Write a protein that binds this ligand. Structure first.
Ligand SMILES: [Cl-]
Ligand SMILES: [Fe+3]
Ligand SMILES: [Fe+3]
Ligand SMILES: [Fe+3]
Lengths: 392, 132, 168, 515, 392, 140, 137
């Protein structure tokens, strides 16, 4: 006999359901049942992704694309608007135009990552039961993988936190979603690197999965000096939210990051008998390509080709690229010193192998980004600039 | 088109002795060939949209013999010859990924020869492998 | 008259005590064959233990099977019946027997008796199952020839039933 | 080379793998079925619903997540588990657990089809079906599991896998959609399991029933059963492919019509009376007359769309159909007499038809009132519902010459002196044992195949034992150890105990002693 | 309108809901709400897995463990029972005792495989976008992987079909579930191998993913002669359903299968620069360990230690092991001829590397299976027997 | 070595990763918030609900599947969407869409808390919160 | 012993002018410290089992001030001091995997300081980081 009424449900209680049935009209009062039917579809028909995402941000007409009017109700001390044009150098006729080609709203994003979460733990339980760690090259495992792959988690962690101000400052809903999902994928990468090290620790007596050595390498080893300098600038040195996303994903992570994750740790795992690391890089590289699709749409489809401000935006994108490409080339020049520490494998770790890896990264980058904004780049010159750091 | 495809067509209209007299008539002690198909769709957000915007519009325009009846938990559909549903048309209506495999999540029963081909689900009176 | 409880009763207890006294493969084989001829199939000799015979048969099977593993060389478990016969010869003999049967009534009794005599553990399982299947194929085919050809009055005579009651 | 490659995003869709499955087989002498069969024709067929293992799982998991969301979240928050009319919640103890065994046997039958298939594509298709029948077993279990947790009477929802063994209606369930599938010709499963079982009887049993559930307040069973049947379109299609192969080879086709008739009779013999009884007597609110449900799904639609169409290619209307239609009209009313009279042997609580039920029965089955209705009303007057009455109708039947017999083949009970459905008693002695058969189709089966049909019946096992002892031995009680699971009413008061049963002094006879 | 009544729902229709509420008692009629409360729990509490699975099979008291009574309603022509003791040589006091340690009923099984299904397609879409196939050794890709990994799909396919009669013949519910889930995992393995080959074909001009060459190799190449002979025997040569499961998973697949999938194709992929194949072998090896947990429970916990028939069962299990271990050793001796075709890698494809791989496989097998049933095995003798097939 | 290894089945649970998150930060002069604040105190705190990205997704996806099953399957089959008293169906036009903008602004506010946090554990926690506020926008 | 934790305790029993008179009384224009915690659980199959077999049995036995009220879609729980739920106890009851993370799927709200520790979820009146521990052990 609780103190408060046991409320009767209108759906199942006879008298309340009868009252409701009498109140509800015998016909619909409009035929337009498409939620936010007025959104301009990017594709042949409106997607649920667009319906649930688009125009959630309440921008007024003085922020390009907004449907509302008037000033904000409360602004920062001094007058900074809640959201404002001062947040970025780039301009557009409509900040809402961006569309993630994977069409991720929150549900499909966590559904997919949940799959990866549960399968990873099943995979690990079977891999430990298999004993497959027994054939890994021990020098690779202990001196290269544990230490320098461990150190790379700090690059992913910094790129994650570069999104904090982006999440506050950016000017539309689909952009905010892209940015936040990109950020989680970066902190996931860092956490997965540590998960692999913690897992190997359970299999290999004496293998130390503490971050002390990785952190020492990230913060003081010349191999990561250029990388750390760039991440520090992208994360904490600027606040233009378009500059952060472009420098972070389209320049630094697309060159240095792809070389480190794909050309070094993933590729060489499959030269030194490492049957574990490819399971983890499979995830970071899937995340990179998903993020790239959305970053490509924001900066190429929307901003570099905005009918009014495309050339204007390319002027800034070109200047940013010149700067952060120089930062990334310096980072790669530092990083290829790591080859001095690995066992030589013809076609992979010799000068020819490293050159072909740099040609893939700079060549792919020229196609995927530089050509799309009009940034001239001599691929051979960048390869040679990095190879000046290769010992031999 | 289309009264013969109603759930309560023919003998099903009769009750009491009249029903019994036809049920037990000599001519109704053997089966009678039918050119119909029956499709049952489990009620759900996706199915109800397909019923209203596909089956009862383009479907019925192409096959005016189609009958749809409300059976509480499911839709009962009966038609001459064949019924078809293109999952690509459903996907466009629903605004979310929707392959033929996803269409079948709420296709609950078939009386007829059923199959998928491409993005299209079909149930037909045809006897494939026997008919020409 | 009055049945005892289903799963625990004096008939099952009494037969368990009989089974426990078996000490050799030869003795247990004659025991289980005699049991299956006397108490299983429509051609059994007695229904006196009808609601208990299937459980009792299980218990005899268990005793014979353990005696086999304790007493016999492994090769015999694979290639011989516990009668001493070659398992493959048993298979060939009974498949030929049923293929020579001239009527469904001859074929059915050959299949039934094969099972009464050679059901595992008498015959190795793999040999038994493939022989039983080959026999069943023949029996099914001959029985499903003109299945509806004989009126019920005639089938009753062919089967040899004593008709005790026909309603209407 | 090492620099140039197409980086367009591609995967591999299920149909791209599926087109190579046929090539996964290879030839060797022993590559043939292990099971006996009359059917040896060419059967290199094509799957109509292309699936591979990964896509099979994706589809079924998507079905599951929606089903379990509705059950564990939405309907639980609504308290729907106890919004069911007691008659229907009792009915689902029997429908769901009995179907469960059909589904379980369907696993085994589907494995025989897997084993006897000769095409890799068909072996692939039948493994998917094998998996589906496991899915359905667990779905049926989950319904009774959910009822055990949320319905006002968990007893019998919570233990049918042992308490079903007490009673005679369970015996026939072990044949209908069970032994009748798995104990016979493996290729013939395409006819009995699939062409008849799946293509005909699952529709009324699993689909039509959901509307009766909803009518009586049960939204659990529709949520699950409607998902169960989504898998059946694959199964029907698998079966039809093999039926075509059979019809196309004259040596195989000569067996098809006899196998079809035997399957149809075997299944309808039990399905028709038992599900009609459960629909009409196990409900308060009725959707339509059972005989109309049966006319729609079995006679007109299955009969016309499958069998009638296949008449163009030599398939004959089952010769037993006339006998079956008589069963569809009256046999469930006959069965109700036995079910109510022997209620203590079940695991469900029963309700005699009330005054509006009786008017509905007479309006839709004229003659019901003067036969079945008068009997039920007299039992009520004698104390049918009252634990202090000392009255159980089975004894009353015997005292008036209305003996109950069990068909040696189908296990369906038969009361010749009261039945209006199809049947007549034949009692034969063979090799010192008496046997009771009840129709022309089953009598033939037993006469030709006596060694297939040696099923002990409840009178043979329980002979001379008192009812309450049998019930107690079989665990037919609630957690207090004394109140029966079964009841002759659906109220919450005056529940019958073992002592209440014992007072009636009901002892099992030998019904064939008189012959 | 429609021809048939629009049935009113008892849950929401006021009049029917009021009638129902009047009929439903104000109190529960029993307190035992645990579905099949009488099952003997294997673990500290009864599991949902057990509740939904156990005693679904309607066995009578004359099949050990059954709770029902009397003969079957309908038997085969001749008298074979629906289920029966004649189906296997092994004996037990209760056929229901088996428990899958993963506790898989149908739902958790398809939930998990659904995760792998969808993540696989995302991985492939990103892997193709990454271009990572560019660094694979072409000879490995074309002459070893495409041809002999493809041919391995026929071993998996045959092991899949070995379960057809098991699914019909076996004597309890938990066993039937274990067997059918093992069968799908085996046909999945075969389908996944073909999936990988079809995928490479989209990336590598001239790469032929037809099964013609794989099938020719499986059916006529000496390297697979012994394997195919064993698979043919396990699948179609016997019907004892315990013999099939033991010979198939606990002997053949645990020695030859593990060597081929793990020691050859997975291990050497990570020596020849193959960043694709480990994603696929990750799945077959996860499935192998899950299947092993269940196979181990059936044969070790239940049958090899059954209080009445443990020693009896070990007599048969030892005889089967003698036979099928000989078949598997012969299969491995044939298979190691494949090393004559691969590029030499010290510690991996030389005599020492192959010797250590066979020591892992036979050594693990002795621990995982042989020791548990009392089967004496000299690991060095088996290694030496297989190395007689290795071309120095 | 190459032959001997512990083959006990193990994984890595979320809390085992979480305990190393605090060490993911490193010191540099510009490592400080971009936003104006009056609050400059030490704020090295520990999260009370240990979560990592993979477990965040697992948890929220599990909530979602049950929610969307109820909506798209059960309640739609019941016709519940039109069983609402008109006054209340009208009220939900404004409650849900007005709440939507609150959730949307909560994304941005949570990002400011993420930016102004000084502990790696708190930055991790505020990203999870940022993600939740997106979830809530889409739920409304 | 628990009436003060009822949803309609105290002023909430009054209506009309009697309610207004206490609501606007001078002494009720500032907050009053409370030692209680409030926990809201979303109704579901799992939660409903936890309510009946944990919170209302062992929970109330350890903390008899607990009050549970039915609020249609959720359970409202109020108690002095603290409420705890051990996911390991819930898993034992449910017969399926159930970590503390799974417990939170239907933990809808908290008024108090909440946290997980091992397999146990707790909401307490304690002000962790401010209140000082009572013992050194
Ligand atoms: Cl630490
Ligand atoms: Fe089924
Ligand atoms: Fe089926
Ligand atoms: Fe929020």
């Amino acid at each position: 006999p609780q103190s408060s009424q046991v409320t009767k449900r209108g759906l199942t209680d006879p008298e309340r359901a009868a009252i409701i049935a009498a109140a509800v009209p015998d016909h619909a009062l409009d035929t337009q049942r498409k939620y936010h039917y007025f959104i301009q579809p990017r594709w042949k028909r409106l997607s649920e992704y667009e319906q649930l995402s688009c125009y959630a941000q309440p921008n007024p007409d003085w922020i390009a694309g907004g449907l509302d009017w008037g000033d904000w109700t409360q602004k920062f001390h001094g007058g900074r608007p809640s959201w404002g044009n001062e947040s970025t150098e780039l301009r557009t006729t409509d900040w809402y135009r961006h569309r993630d080609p994977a069409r991720r709203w929150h549900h499909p994003y966590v559904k997919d990552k949940s799959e990866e979460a549960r399968y990873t733990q099943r995979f690990l339980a079977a891999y430990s039961s298999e004993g497959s760690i027994r054939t890994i090259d021990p020098y690779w495992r202990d001196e290269i993988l544990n230490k320098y792959f461990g150190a790379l988690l700090y690059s992913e962690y910094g790129l994650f936190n570069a999104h904090s101000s982006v999440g506050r400052d950016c000017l539309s809903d689909t952009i905010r979603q892209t940015a936040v999902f990109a950020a989680l994928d970066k902190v996931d990468n860092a956490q997965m690197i540590q998960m692999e090290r913690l897992f190997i620790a359970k299999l290999v007596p004496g293998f130390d999965a503490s971050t002390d050595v990785p952190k020492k390498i990230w913060t003081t080893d010349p191999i990561y000096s250029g990388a750390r300098a760039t991440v520090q600038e992208i994360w904490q040195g600027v606040q233009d939210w378009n500059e952060i996303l472009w420098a972070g994903h389209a320049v630094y992570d697309a060159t240095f990051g792809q070389f480190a994750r794909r050309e070094f740790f993933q590729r060489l795992a499959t030269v030194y008998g490492d049957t574990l690391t490819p399971f983890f890089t499979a995830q970071s590289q899937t995340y990179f390509q998903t993020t790239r699709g959305a970053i490509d749409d924001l900066f190429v489809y929307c901003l570099a080709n905005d009918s009014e401000f495309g050339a204007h935006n390319r002027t800034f994108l070109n200047a940013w690229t010149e700067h952060y490409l120089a930062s990334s080339v310096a980072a790669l020049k530092d990083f290829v010193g790591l080859y001095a520490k690995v066992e030589k494998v013809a076609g992979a770790t010799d000068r020819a192998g490293v050159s072909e890896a740099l040609q893939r990264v700079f060549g792919d980058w020229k196609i995927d980004y530089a050509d799309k904004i009009g940034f001239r780049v001599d691929v051979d010159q960048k390869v040679d600039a990095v190879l000046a750091g290769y010992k031999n | 088109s289309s009264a013969h495809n109603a759930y309560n067509a023919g003998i099903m209209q009769k009750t009491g002795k009249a029903f019994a007299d036809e049920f037990f008539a000599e001519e109704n002690q053997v089966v009678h060939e039918s050119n119909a198909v029956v499709l049952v769709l489990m009620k759900s957000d996706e199915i109800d949209a397909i019923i209203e915007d596909i089956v009862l519009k383009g479907g019925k325009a192409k096959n005016p013999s189609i009958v749809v009846e409300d059976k509480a938990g499911f839709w009962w559909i009966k038609a001459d010859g064949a019924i078809e549903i293109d999952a690509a048309e459903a996907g466009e209506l629903l605004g979310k990924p929707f392959s033929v495999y996803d269409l079948l999540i709420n296709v609950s029963s078939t009386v007829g020869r059923a199959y998928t081909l491409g993005t299209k689900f079909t149930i037909t009176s045809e006897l494939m492998g026997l008919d020409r | 008259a009055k049945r005892e409880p289903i799963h625990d009763n004096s008939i099952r207890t009494e037969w368990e005590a009989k089974i426990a006294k078996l000490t050799s493969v030869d003795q247990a084989t004659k025991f289980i064959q005699d049991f299956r001829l006397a108490y299983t199939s429509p051609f059994r000799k007695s229904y006196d233990i009808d609601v208990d015979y299937q459980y009792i048969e299980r218990k005899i099977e268990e005793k014979l099977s353990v005696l086999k593993t304790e007493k016999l060389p492994v090769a015999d478990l694979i290639t011989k019946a516990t009668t001493g016969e070659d398992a493959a010869a048993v298979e060939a003999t009974w498949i030929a027997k049923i293929k020579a049967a001239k009527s469904k009534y001859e074929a059915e009794r050959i299949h039934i008796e094969f099972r009464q005599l050679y059901k595992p553990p008498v015959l190795p399982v793999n040999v038994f199952l493939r022989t039983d299947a080959a026999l069943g194929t023949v029996l099914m085919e001959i029985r499903n020839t003109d299945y509806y050809g004989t009126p019920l009055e005639g089938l009753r005579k062919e089967r040899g039933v004593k008709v005790l009651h026909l309603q209407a | 080379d090492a620099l140039k490659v197409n980086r367009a995003p591609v995967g591999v869709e299920p149909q791209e793998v599926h087109k190579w499955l046929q090539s996964f087989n290879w030839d060797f002498k022993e590559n043939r079925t292990k099971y006996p069969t009359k059917y040896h024709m060419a059967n290199e067929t094509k799957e109509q619903f292309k699936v591979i293992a990964k896509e099979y799982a994706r589809m079924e998991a998507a079905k599951d997540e929606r089903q379990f969301g509705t059950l564990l979240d939405g309907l639980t928050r609504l308290g729907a588990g106890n919004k069911v009319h007691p008659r229907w919640g009792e009915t689902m103890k029997v429908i769901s657990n009995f179907l469960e065994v059909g589904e379980y046997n369907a696993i085994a039958a589907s494995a025989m089809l897997w084993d006897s298939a000769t095409a890799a594509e068909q072996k692939n298709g039948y493994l998917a079906q094998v998996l589906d029948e496991i899915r359905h077993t667990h779905q049926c279990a989950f319904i009774n599991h959910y009822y055990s947790k949320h319905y006002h009477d968990p007893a019998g929802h919570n233990d049918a896998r042992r308490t079903r063994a007490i009673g005679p209606l369970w015996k026939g369930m072990k044949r209908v959609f069970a032994d009748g599938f798995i104990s016979g010709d493996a290729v013939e499963c395409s006819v009995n399991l699939q062409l008849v079982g799946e293509a005909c009887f699952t529709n009324p049993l699993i689909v039509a029933v959901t509307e009766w559930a909803s009518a009586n307040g049960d939204e659990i069973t529709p949520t699950v059963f409607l998902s169960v049947e989504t898998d059946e379109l694959r199964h029907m299609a698998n079966g039809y492919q093999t039926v075509v192969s059979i019809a196309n080879d004259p040596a195989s086709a000569k067996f098809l019509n006899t196998d079809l008739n035997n399957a149809f009779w075997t299944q309808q013999k039990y399905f028709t009376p038992v599900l009609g009884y459960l629909f009409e007597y196990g409900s308060k609110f009725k959707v339509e007359p059972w005989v109309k449900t049966w006319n729609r799904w079995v006679y007109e639609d299955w009969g016309g769309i499958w069998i009638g169409r296949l008449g163009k290619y030599g398939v004959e209307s089952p010769a037993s159909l006339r006998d079956a239609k008589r069963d569809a009209y009256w046999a469930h009313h006959d069965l109700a007499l036995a079910a109510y009279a022997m209620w203590p042997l079940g695991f469900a609580r029963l309700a005699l038809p009330d005054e509006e039920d009786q008017a509905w029965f007479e309006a839709n089955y004229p003659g019901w009132a003067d036969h079945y209705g008068k009997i039920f009303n007299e039992w009520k007057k004698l104390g049918y519902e009252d634990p202090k009455s000392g009255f159980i109708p089975y004894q009353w039947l015997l005292a008036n010459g209305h003996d109950v017999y069990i068909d040696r083949v189908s296990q369906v009970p038969f009361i010749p002196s009261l039945a209006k459905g199809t049947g007549s008693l034949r009692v034969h002695e063979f090799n010192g044992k008496k046997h009771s058969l009840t129709d022309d189709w089953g009598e033939r089966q037993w006469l030709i195949e006596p060694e297939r049909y040696e099923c002990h019946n409840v009178f043979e096992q329980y002979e001379g034992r008192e009812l309450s002892e049998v019930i107690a031995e079989g665990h037919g009680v609630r957690s207090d150890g004394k109140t029966l699971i079964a009841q002759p009413h659906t109220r919450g008061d005056n529940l019958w105990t073992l002592e209440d049963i014992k007072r009636a002094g009901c002892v099992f006879p030998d019904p064939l002693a008189k012959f």
